[PDB]
Design a protein around this ligand. Structure first.
Ligand SMILES: [Cu+2]
Ligand SMILES: [Cu+2]
Ligand SMILES: [Zn+2]
Ligand SMILES: [Zn+2]
Ligand SMILES: [Zn+2]
Ligand SMILES: [Zn+2]
Ligand SMILES: [Zn+2]
Lengths: 152, 153
């Protein structure tokens, strides 16, 4: 079943949706994201960062793409992808996105290195532009515009 | 994504009130992502896959009976149960919204399967006015059909 509810907040700390997580059949994790107040018809970058902490306005604070296996950024990068790299989100006419994505290289299991549940927590971030699955460290996805901290 | 087979949900008045999408579960059966609105805040609402992909307003009787390939009685708590199409109640927010993923372990999209909901007829997902008591034939005393979406084909 889905759980570990995470609330999503924008630059101004307004609630703009939520995330929940399922230990996947199969395998790794499934991420249910349901958001609003986003740039309509946009394609928007989206990653798991290494610090469960969401400080306005900019969310630097932190990280850090979740990168326990110390690779570079991007699906299409031969040296790359960060365990926390996820596909771009597609926004409805709406301004809303409501999907389940699989993060195959993540975990909640204790003693797991891919464990995104840990002392520090992890944070889910939606970026301002679309990700190019290639450029370090960011895929040129731009500013951090939405954040959600996972602890527990 | 791997969720697909998008199904638009409509109420008795013909208002668009969200959607369903479906995933072939590994494992097993299907996972149903339901994201609906304009429902009774804080209610538990009956929720079933019906046998025919037909959602004729306002009553939705054109969807025909709960999907029951194995010929059982209704209800998770009926020892003579349950229908393949029986799903847990939807638990609505103060929002009037439900946005959840539930497993339907006695379904399939495979042409070869007895449990196929993507059959010649198709199927309909139906939300009811009241809770399913998980016991009473033939629909758990769920009452009227209030939201319908058809999976054709
Ligand atoms: Cu990022
Ligand atoms: Cu029903
Ligand atoms: Zn990255
Ligand atoms: Zn039934
Ligand atoms: Zn959803
Ligand atoms: Zn069953
Ligand atoms: Zn049918």
């Amino acid at each position: 079943a889905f759980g570990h509810h995470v609330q999503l907040v924008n630059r101004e700390g307004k609630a703009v949706g939520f995330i929940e997580i399922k230990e996947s059949d199969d395998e790794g994790l499934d991420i249910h994201i349901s958001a609003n107040s986003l740039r309509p018809g946009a394609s928007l970058g989206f990653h798991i960062h290494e610090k469960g902490s969401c400080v306005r306005p900019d969310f630097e604070s932190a990280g850090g793409h979740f990168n326990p296996l110390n690779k570079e950024h991007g699906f299409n990068n031969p040296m790359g992808h960060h365990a926390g790299d996820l596909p771009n989100l597609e926004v409805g006419a709406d301004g809303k996105v409501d999907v389940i994505m699989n993060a195959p290289d993540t975990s909640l299991k204790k003693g797991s290195k891919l464990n995104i549940l840990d002392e520090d927590g992890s944070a889910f971030i939606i970026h301002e532009q679309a990700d190019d699955y290639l450029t370090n460290p960011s895929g040129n996805s731009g500013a951090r515009i939405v954040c959600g901290a996972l602890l527990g």
